[PDB]
Amino acid sequence: HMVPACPPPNPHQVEQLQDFVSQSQRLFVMTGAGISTESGIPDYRSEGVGLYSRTERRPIQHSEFVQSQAARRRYWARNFVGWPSFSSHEPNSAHVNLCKWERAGRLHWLVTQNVDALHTKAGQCRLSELHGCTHRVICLGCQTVTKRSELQERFLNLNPSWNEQAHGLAPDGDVFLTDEQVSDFQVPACTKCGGILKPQVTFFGDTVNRGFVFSIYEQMKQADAMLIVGSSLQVYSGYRFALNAKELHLPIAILNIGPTRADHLAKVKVSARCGDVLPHILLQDQ
Ligand SMILES: Nc1ncnc2c1ncn2[C@@H]1O[C@H](COP(=O)(O)OP(=O)(O)OC[C@H]2O[C@H](O)[C@H](O)[C@@H]2O)[C@@H](O)[C@H]1O
Ligand SMILES: [Zn+2]
């Protein structure tokens, strides 16, 4: 299924990660798509199983969505089909345990690259969604934000004879459809202004808002350590925060099955399934 192959977890790494967490009172956590593979959502870059390893799916480019009605129709028809399954995924034990650490006052702040809403479903409050969330829709004309669930209803009224089955769900809820399968589909406009609606996610080629990025960096200034969970950090948007931790001289730990771009920066690396390991990390001696 969606989790990449990994050797049995090594208990000495687990013990090293524990010693790391025990020394932190204000943990800054970064997560990527690897935290959600145990929920049934594929990641992008896992050897063998990741969308880009195993398939020839290609990300939509920001520029193309913005400049082409036909691209927007393609994008939304696929998103439509994928939405009932994508929106139904549930948080796993890794999401839950990170929420426990927050409750315990040990997690200072968590940034995610994921768009799946799973940390929100788990109850994580001290959260930044770096790349947005597919559960939100924004208008490119007026910047009004609405719920993607409400858009589903609008798609059904506009496209009453639409059916296709959902095939190859991606980490952003996209499913494959052919250009002829999607050719007819009609996209609802903004109810306030009539402008073009976009999911409130940072597509390839877009950039994260600078004020938002700055505000996350501000949260980092109070942390005393960084943990990265389930990201290859091959995408600069995420890797810059590990670079920032190193500039702040924070110790860095990584819980990730494959290699990451920040491996060179880590004090501790646990190559294991995150859901196997996080439940064992304790916040109180026991
Ligand atoms: N259960 C697991 N436990 C631990 N590690 C895991 C697990 N499942 C997978 N991994 C590891 O999880 C890691 C997943 O890495 P990648 O697939 O690059 O996802 P990203 O979140 O970093 O992608 C960043 C952006 O790229 C996109 O364009 C979007 O914009 C994304 O937001 C691998 O190293 C796996 O070994
Ligand atoms: Zn509008």
Marked catalytic residue, from 131, 167, 249, 280: 131
C-alpha–C-alpha distance, residues 51 and 42, integer Å: 7
- Specify the residue with its C-alpha closest to ligand 1, atom 27: 44
Q: Which residues pair with 139 in a beta bridge?
A: 197
**Technique used:** X-ray
Tell me the structure's resolution in angstroms, rounded to a single decimal: 1.6
Task: Tell me the two tokens of residue 100.
Answer: 């426990």
Report the nearest atom of ligand 1 relative to the CA of 256. 5
- Block residue for tokens 């992008």: 44
C-alpha–C-alpha distance, residues 135 and 149, integer Å: 7
Identity of the amino acid at 39? S
C-alpha–C-alpha distance, residues 270 and 20, integer Å: 11
Phi, psi (rounded to 5 degrees) for 29: -115, 135
Q: Give the residue ranges of DSSP H helices in the chain.
A: 11-22, 51-54, 62-67, 69-86, 93-103, 118-122, 148-158, 210-220, 236-247, 274-277
Q: What is the DSSP letter of 204?
A: B
CB 230 within 8 A of CB 253: no
CA dihedral (141, 146, 149, 151) in degrees, to 10, reads: -30
Furthest-apart CA pair in the chain: how many Å? 61
> Is residue 139 marked as binding?
yes
Task: Please tell me the number of the ligand nearest to residue 142's CA.
Answer: 2
C-alpha–C-alpha distance, residues 112 and 212, integer Å: 13
Pocket probe mutation, ligand 1, options 3, 37, 227, max atoms within 8 Å of Cβ? 37
> Is residue 275 marked as binding?
no
Q: Which residues contact residue 265 at a Cβ distance below 8 angstroms, ignoring those fewer than 6 apart?
A: 242, 243, 245, 246, 252
CB 216 within 8 A of CB 243: no
Task: Tell me the two tokens of residue 206.
Answer: 């877009």
Residue 3 near ligand 1, beta carbon < 6 Å: yes
CB 242 within 8 A of CB 226: yes
Residue 131 near ligand 1, beta carbon < 6 Å: yes
Task: Check if 95 is active-site.
Answer: no
Residue 38 near ligand 1, beta carbon < 6 Å: yes
C-alpha–C-alpha distance, residues 124 and 122, integer Å: 6
Q: How far apart, in Å, are the Cα atoms of 259 and each of 40, 71, 215, 244?
A: 21, 34, 28, 19
Identity of the amino acid at 45? R
CA of 4 to the centre of ligand 2 (A): 41
Residue 203 near ligand 1, beta carbon < 6 Å: no
